[PDB]
């Protein structure tokens, strides 16, 4: 396929700080991956992000009913949709599954699977005390299905090893034990 | 604390569009523009919420209008192809005879056109496979997931085959027990 490609994106972004106590709405226009013009609710009118967006910003800023409508969007759009989705997004809790197994390169893998939300602390312990400098991880992995996972690996010569998991779904830490 | 993004694109000359809602990087729903129906990322979301899927066509029609304008304004500057990072991992730790899911993660690419095939022992498999639509990234590139439910065996190897205009050859990511 010889033909050249041309792509327009638009992202209508609602940013929430302390639930709906503080909201910022951003109406962002893209040509390929280059933002050319944006509306920001903290500014209350359009601004050109590049040369290519100057005509659209002038044009749109001259239509006062258009700007009037966009400035109500923190209430009619952002706060409305937070309120629609809260109970199954903001309040979604899915518990982690924790396994420990040895791997080749010798590694103790602490696998933490199927949890929501994303915020998690995984710590390695060897006979009592905490190891940081021999630990390597996957980072947080989004599975694309409203579920994360992470693999936290201890580079070690296998004593009693304990993997500690802290997640919002758990009243207290989950601590899994592995004996050599 | 949280971001909700209504993200849309339109692409010429393919005339491919997409309309979708994202919460903190997860898809809430997209509109199937053909059928005019709301496709919920999880079944359960559709018990709590509705959408006017009919109206998504109006939004895409504005994006096409804007594209035609920006195409001329840019002097017909075409998109630069960016080939994907591809990674293959399981839902959970693999145990023999314990059903599991292979995830193919296709990340950081444009334009949003991609051929993905699951290969079992080098042959295409479709039983049970599902995929997401193109998902937006903070850098305005795309990411995408394909899923293959499978029964783990010592006798099968798997590959995710990914075709994109940014790549010389198709890209194969290997997995095996």
């Amino acid at each position: 396929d010889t033909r050249p490609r041309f792509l327009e994106q638009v992202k209508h972004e609602c940013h929430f700080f302390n639930g709906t106590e503080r909201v910022r709405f951003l109406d962002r226009y893209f040509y390929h991956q280059e933002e050319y013009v944006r509306f920001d609710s903290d500014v209350g009118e359009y601004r050109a992000v590049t040369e290519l967006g100057r005509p659209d910003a002038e044009y749109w800023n001259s239509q006062k009913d258009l700007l009037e409508q966009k400035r109500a969007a923190v209430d009619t759009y952002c706060r409305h949709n937070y309120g629609v989705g809260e109970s199954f997004t903001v309040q979604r809790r899915v518990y982690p599954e924790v396994t420990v197994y040895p791997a080749k390169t010798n590694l103790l893998v602490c696998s933490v699977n199927g949890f929501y939300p994303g915020s998690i602390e995984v710590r390695w312990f060897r006979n009592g005390q905490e190891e940081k400098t021999g630990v390597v991880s996957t980072g947080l992995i989004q599975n694309g299905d409203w579920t994360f996972q992470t693999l936290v690996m201890l580079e070690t010569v296998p004593e009693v090893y304990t993997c500690q998991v802290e997640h919002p779904s758990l009243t207290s830490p989950l601590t899994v034990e592995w004996r050599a | 604390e949280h971001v909700i993004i209504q993200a849309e694109f339109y692409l010429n000359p393919d005339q491919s569009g997409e309309f979708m809602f994202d919460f903190d990087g997860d898809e809430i729903f997209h509109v199937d523009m053909a059928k005019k129906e709301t496709v919920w990322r999880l079944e359960e979301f559709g018990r709590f919420a509705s959408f006017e899927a009919q109206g998504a066509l109006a939004n895409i029609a504005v994006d096409k209008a804007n594209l035609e304008i920006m195409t001329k304004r840019s002097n017909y500057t075409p998109i630069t192809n960016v080939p994907p990072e591809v990674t293959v991992l399981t839902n959970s730790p693999v145990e023999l005879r314990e059903p599991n899911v292979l995830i193919c993660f296709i990340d950081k690419f444009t334009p949003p056109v991609v051929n993905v095939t699951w290969l079992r022992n080098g042959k295409p498999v479709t039983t049970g496979v599902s995929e997401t639509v193109f998902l937006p990234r903070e850098d305005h590139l795309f990411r995408k997931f394909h899923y293959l439910p499978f029964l783990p065996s010592t006798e099968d190897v798997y590959d995710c085959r990914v075709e994109h205009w940014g790549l010389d050859e198709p890209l194969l990511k290997h997995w095996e027990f």
């Binding site: 109406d27 969007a73 989705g85 | 804007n66």
Partner: peptide, 14 residues
């Protein structure tokens, strides 16, 4: 129960 609301892009000038 409750509907999600979309906003529409503004159309630019030629």
């Amino acid at each position: 129960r409750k509907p999600f609301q979309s906003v529409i892009a503004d159309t630019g000038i030629s």
